[PDB]
Amino acid sequence: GLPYPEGYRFWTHVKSMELKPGHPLYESFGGLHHIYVNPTGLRTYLEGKKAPFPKGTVIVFDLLEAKVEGNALLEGPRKLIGVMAKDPGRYPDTGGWGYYAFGPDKKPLAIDPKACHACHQGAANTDYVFSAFRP
Amino acid sequence: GLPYPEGYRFWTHVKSMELKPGHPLYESFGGLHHIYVNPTGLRTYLEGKKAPFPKGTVIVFDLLEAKVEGNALLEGPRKLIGVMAKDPGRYPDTGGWGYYAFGPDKKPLAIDPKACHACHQGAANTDYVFSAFRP
Ligand code: HEC
Ligand code: HEC
């Protein structure tokens, strides 16, 4: 597999989004997520994903429970992290991306990377990455 | 004043929070905010703010409109950034912190730094910083 991306918390914050109940992705990715990109990937995002992400790009989808307390949305406990790692050589079947997921204990989750990719094929125009950098 | 903190977007993401209507800070800081700390300040946060932040610490409060569209919370347009810059020498009246605010055009806002500090005095125990680093 891919080793847990130690240090992703200190990478560049790309964007945030909360998926609320009834969202089509709510059952698998419900809650508040933050996206982080490592230094290798950053410039592709800043230029608007017009060229493919270089090999060594790592993108982290950090999913937290969304807690409404009083009149605030707060970050709750981590549910999981999703990872995409670019290596055209290693991952020819999934558009050159390695798809990985880890739970809050940092242990790998048993996922079908092909099922991750199947949805990310919707974003094949921007190298299988949905998110845009929010300045 | 303080020059606009160019490059804060690439600093460490400390935490996020949405203030909803009826929150006591809703009129001035309503929306989704993200907090960023520069490298100088990071370690004080990681150690749980038991010691004061070193001189040269810069913390950014990035406030965005919260847009509910479908069953999602999305980041809307920037409302403002608030900045705290640690310099015990320059800011003896406000606990060694410079308080600054900038609008979306990056232009300074006319604020009373003493009014910022008056509220942050609630957090005098942790060097006038409310937020904790969310691992
Ligand atoms: C559709 C049914 C999806 C499935 C299955 C998976 N992902 Fe995905 N992913 C999806 C969307 C719509 C987005 C964008 C969210 C946003 O805030 O804009 C994402 C994003 C990611 C990211 C961030 C990179 C990006 O493409 O924007 C990563 C690291 C990611 N997803 C990983 C991932 C993994 C590991 C999956 C299988 C376990 C997976 N995704 C499935 C939509 C869908
Ligand atoms: C209470 C009435 C406040 C006034 C007036 C101001 N601030 Fe503040 N600030 C407040 C809280 C409760 C928090 C924490 C928010 C969170 O998500 O936990 C903040 C935070 C900041 C930050 C981030 C650093 C921190 O203390 O956690 C900055 C950079 C900041 N605030 C700046 C700021 C400025 C420039 C103000 C006057 C224009 C100001 N604050 C007023 C509460 C209050």
Residue numbers in the entry:
A (entry chain A), B (entry chain A): 1 to 135
Paper text:
Other users tend to focus on groups of proteins with homologous functions from a range of microorganisms. This is the case of a group working with cytochromes c′. A second cytochrome c′ protein from T. thermophilus (TTCP), in this case with β-sheet fold, presented a greater challenge. A full comparison between the RT and 100 K structures was not feasible because the crystallization conditions as well as space group differed.
The VMXi beamline and its associated PXF within the Research Complex at Harwell offer a highly automated pipeline where researchers provide a suitable protein sample that is used for robotic crystallization, monitoring and subsequent in situ data collection from crystals in crystallization plates or in thin-film sample delivery systems. Here we present illustrative examples of data measured using VMXi from a variety of proteins comprising both conventional crystallographic standards and ‘real world’ user samples. Routine RT data collection provides a useful capability that is highly relevant to studying protein dynamics and ligand binding without the complication of cryo-cooling.
